[PDB]
Amino acid sequence: GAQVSTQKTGAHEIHYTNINYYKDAASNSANRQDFTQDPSKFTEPVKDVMIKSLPAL
């Protein structure tokens, strides 16, 4: 029951193993490998979609 995943490196120029020892999910290590994001929530809160090229109004 071992997980193998890639580690942070560089663009031009790499595996580590992890095993859980405790029965409580709160004991796991931080899951700091997620990088998903979406700023449209705060930057485009309007109802009607506005095209950048077209005039605002």
| Residue 50 binding result from another protein, its own copies, none, given CB thresholds of 5 to 8 Å by partner type | another protein
Q: What is the DSSP letter of 32?
A: T
Q: How far is the CB of 31 from its own copies (least distance, A)?
A: 10
CA proximity to 3, closest of 15, 40, 14, 13: 15
| 2 vs 51, beta carbon nearer its own copies | 2
CA proximity to 20, closest of 8, 28, 12: 28
Residues that bind another protein (CB under 8 A): 1-5, 8, 10-12, 17, 24, 26-32, 34-37, 39-48, 50, 52-57
